Amino acid sequence: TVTVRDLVVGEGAPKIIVSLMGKTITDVKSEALAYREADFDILEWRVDHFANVTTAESVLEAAGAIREIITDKPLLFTFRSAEQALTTGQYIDLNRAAVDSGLVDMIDLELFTGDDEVKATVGYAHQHNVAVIMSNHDFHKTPAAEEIVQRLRKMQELGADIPKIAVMPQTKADVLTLLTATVEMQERYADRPIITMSMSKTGVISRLAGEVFGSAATFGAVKKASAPGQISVADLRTVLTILHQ
Amino acid sequence: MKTVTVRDLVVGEGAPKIIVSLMGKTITDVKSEALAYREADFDILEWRVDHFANVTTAESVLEAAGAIREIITDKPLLFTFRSAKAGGEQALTTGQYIDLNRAAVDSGLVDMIDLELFTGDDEVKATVGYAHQHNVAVIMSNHDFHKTPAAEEIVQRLRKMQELGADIPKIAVMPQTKADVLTLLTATVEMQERYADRPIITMSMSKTGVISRLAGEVFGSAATFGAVKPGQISVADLRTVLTILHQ
Ligand SMILES: O=C(O)C1=CC(=O)[C@@H](O)[C@H](O)C1
Numbered sequence: 001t002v003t004v005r006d007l008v009v010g011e012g013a014p015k016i017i018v019s020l021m022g023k024t025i026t027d028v029k030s031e032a033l034a035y036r037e038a039d040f041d042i043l044e045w046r047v048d049h050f051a052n053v054t055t056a057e058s059v060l061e062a063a064g065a066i067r068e069i070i071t072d073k074p075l076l077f078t079f080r081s082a083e084q085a086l087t088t089g090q091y092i093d094l095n096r097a098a099v100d101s102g103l104v105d106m107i108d109l110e111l112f113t114g115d116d117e118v119k120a121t122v123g124y125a126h127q128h129n130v131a132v133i134m135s136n137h138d139f140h141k142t143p144a145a146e147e148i149v150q151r152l153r154k155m156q157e158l159g160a161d162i163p164k165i166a167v168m169p170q171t172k173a174d175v176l177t178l179l180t181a182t183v184e185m186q187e188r189y190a191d192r193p194i195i196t197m198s199m200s201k202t203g204v205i206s207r208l209a210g211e212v213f214g215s216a217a218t219f220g221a222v223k224k225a226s227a228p229g230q231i232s233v234a235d236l237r238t239v240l241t242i243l244h245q
Numbered sequence: 246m247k248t249v250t251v252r253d254l255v256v257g258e259g260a261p262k263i264i265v266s267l268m269g270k271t272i273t274d275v276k277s278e279a280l281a282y283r284e285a286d287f288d289i290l291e292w293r294v295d296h297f298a299n300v301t302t303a304e305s306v307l308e309a310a311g312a313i314r315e316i317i318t319d320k321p322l323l324f325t326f327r328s329a330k331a332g333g334e335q336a337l338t339t340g341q342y343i344d345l346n347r348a349a350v351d352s353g354l355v356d357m358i359d360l361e362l363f364t365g366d367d368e369v370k371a372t373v374g375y376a377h378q379h380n381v382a383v384i385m386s387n388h389d390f391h392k393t394p395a396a397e398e399i400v401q402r403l404r405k406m407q408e409l410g411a412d413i414p415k416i417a418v419m420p421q422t423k424a425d426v427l428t429l430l431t432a433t434v435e436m437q438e439r440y441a442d443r444p445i446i447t448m449s450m451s452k453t454g455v456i457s458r459l460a461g462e463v464f465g466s467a468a469t470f471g472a473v474k475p476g477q478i479s480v481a482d483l484r485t486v487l488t489i490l491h492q
């Protein structure tokens with residue numbers, strides 16, 4: 001398990017993560033305020049939708065604003081690489097800044113960033129008591145089950161506290177491939193919780209069936225989804241609770 | 246896209262249909278259960294006639310079928326004698342079991358009958374023709390309570406049920422592992438997409454397989470079982486999830 005704040009990830013029913021996507025500090029504040037009564041467990045700040053992402057002061061300022069409004073839930077800092085492109089150097093310093101701010105409980109680092117940069121950045125996070133979700137995505141297709149499994153193992157190998165993979169199905173069988181890889185990884189290789197999802201409405205069951213197949217957290221939407229296939233946070237909590245009985 | 250209409254219900258379209266089973270031993274029990282279930286939100290009422298103690302008394306079976314139809318006037322009634330080989334409550338010879346089903350058809354009180362896959366091909370074909378003549382639909386079923394056959398073996402069974410005339414091929418299998426639940430889902434998708442010219446009903450049993458009861462709209466199973474109430478998923482919870490997944 002992985003305990004963030006007072007949240008234990010990888011035990012009981014899967015935990016719910018919602019994404020905050022504001023462009024400006026005004027949007028970030030109004031979204032955070034609106035999310036405050038929503039029923040979720042971890043708040044993900046999707047900094048890649050933040051217009052002033054290349055200004056350090058602005059990012060720090062926006063993280064504080066979120067933290068001031070959402071005071072109990074764990075905060076996850078995520079720059080998902082697609083609108084404003086960044087260089088590897090920019091991406092790493094951004095995450096380092098986040099870690100050193102004290103305003104975030106977890107960071108997301110992409111698997112295909114670079115081994116040394118990743119291990120370096122992972123080390124820095126842990127010494128600052130910040131958890132690392134190491135992630136990989138494919139928004140166009142689903143890799144073979146054994147490849148999905150290889151990527152999750154590589155993330156464990158790099159020090160991830162929570163390996164994460166999100167893939168896009170093109171067939172219903174592709175949703176089953178994602179689940180097959182989840183089962184295989186969790187049962188045979190995982191020594192930490194993992195997060196897996198097959199995107200789109202076709203893959204929704206992968207957002208619901210985490211307790212049996214092995215994914216420890218799942219994303220839901222408050223009003224706008226952060227990825228296709230996310231159902232409302234309320235609907236998600238409803239289904240996880242039924243499945244936990 | 247492949248559907249079967251039973252009474253006014255279209256099976257195979259929209260959200261999967263919820264089946265509840267009546268398991269009472271006596272006419273009194275049957276009536277009580279039917280009245281209790283009318284207070285629940287299901288689609289199809291299955292009468293598990295193997296539980297009915299007076300099953301070998303034709304008049305008793307006809308009386309009970311009439312009583313149920315008085316209470317549950319809207320919903321389709323499926324007549325199902327689960328054989329003792331399948332861990333039903335009582336033994337009937339093959340001839341008795343065919344006769345029991347022919348009598349359910351002849352009664353005019355049931356909308357569907359269940360016939361087991363390995364009953365006897367020639368008698369199944371005759372019975373299916375008889376049922377069709379009376380506008381009674383046939384669910385053909387097979388259960389593996391011990392294990393999950395390979396996907397292609399599950400597909401093979403479903404295909405044979407269509408070949409025999411089934412309106413709705415139905416299979417239930419027991420997972421021993423988590424991958425087994427996915428094998429049943431794989432067989433459901435392969436059947437629906439490549440070979441089905443009928444709606445199918447598939448299920449992975451036990452707690453571990455409950456996702457197979459929820460995900461039929463995507464994967465291809467036209468109906469699911471719940472309980473009106475410790476044990477399998479409730480009709481209320483099943484409806485809650487099916488509704489969400491239909492949105
Ligand atoms: O195929 C069946 O009649 C059933 C199989 C099961 O595993 C039961 O939970 C279900 O209510 C009825």
Ligand SMILES: *[C@H]1C=C(C(=O)O)C[C@@H](O)[C@@H]1O
Pocket residue numbers: 019044046078080166197199219226227228230
């Ligand atoms: C990770 C995965 C997402 C999903 O597929 O729900 C949403 C995205 O914001 C997260 O980074």
Ligand SMILES: [Cl-]
Pocket residue numbers: 361362363364386387388
């Ligand atoms: Cl059989």
